[PDB]
Amino acid sequence: RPAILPSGQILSNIEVHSHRALFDIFKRFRSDDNNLYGAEFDALLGTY
Amino acid sequence: RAIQQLARNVQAVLDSFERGTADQMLRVLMEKAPPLSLLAPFTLYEGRLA
């Protein structure tokens, strides 16, 4: 569930996966996961 | 005298929130850093630890 326009361009060309546990949640794939290209949301239709 | 003491007291209480963040900065930076002894050789096997 990525953002569209970023805020800060990270510059350090560094390996990521080797530092797995450095942060909470992260998922990796190769390409065309077909989940990322899926629109989905939960709307409320009326207030009364 | 009462008001001058109150001023001289708020001057020291309000002050402490500068040294306070100066101390919290060290307190948080100290826990991130792994010892360099335990880090220098680790970054020479990267990508290979499969």
Side-chain angles (χ1 to χ4, degrees), chain B residues 3-22:
Chain B
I3 183 177
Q4 73 184 359
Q5 197 278 335
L6 181 83
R8 212 173 59 171
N9 197 346
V10 65
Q11 196 52 41
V13 159
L14 190 144
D15 183 315
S16 181
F17 282 138
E18 304 306 87
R19 317 170 170 246
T21 178

Side-chain angles (χ1 to χ4, degrees), chain A residues 18-19, chain B residues 42 49:
Chain A
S18 290
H19 306 164
Chain B
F42 158 77
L49 69 164

Side-chain angles (χ1 to χ4, degrees), chain A residues 14-15 18-20, chain B residues 42 46-49:
Chain A
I14 198 72
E15 166 55 80
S18 290
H19 306 164
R20 262 182 320 274
Chain B
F42 158 77
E46 82 302 338
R48 301 199 38 186
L49 69 164

Side-chain angles (χ1 to χ4, degrees), chain A:
Chain A
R1 201 180 205 177
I4 307 98
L5 196 137
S7 309
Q9 282 74 252
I10 176 61
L11 60 89
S12 78
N13 193 354
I14 198 72
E15 166 55 80
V16 162
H17 157 80
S18 290
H19 306 164
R20 262 182 320 274
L22 205 67
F23 36 74
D24 198 13
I25 293 103
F26 66 98
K27 181 191 58 183
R28 77 203 302 263
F29 44 79
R30 305 196 177 184
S31 296
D32 190 2
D33 55 71
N34 84 21
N35 186 328
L36 160 61
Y37 282 106
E40 182 269 349
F41 61 97
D42 261 8
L44 67 97
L45 312 178
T47 80
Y48 286 117

Side-chain angles (χ1 to χ4, degrees), chain B residues 6-48:
Chain B
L6 181 83
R8 212 173 59 171
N9 197 346
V10 65
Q11 196 52 41
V13 159
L14 190 144
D15 183 315
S16 181
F17 282 138
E18 304 306 87
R19 317 170 170 246
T21 178
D23 172 278
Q24 290 297 107
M25 202 53 51
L26 298 188
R27 288 269 160 169
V28 298
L29 282 198
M30 196 66 213
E31 318 164 13
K32 305 176 42 178
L36 182 70
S37 315
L38 270 300
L39 176 59
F42 158 77
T43 177
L44 274 299
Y45 268 58
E46 82 302 338
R48 301 199 38 186

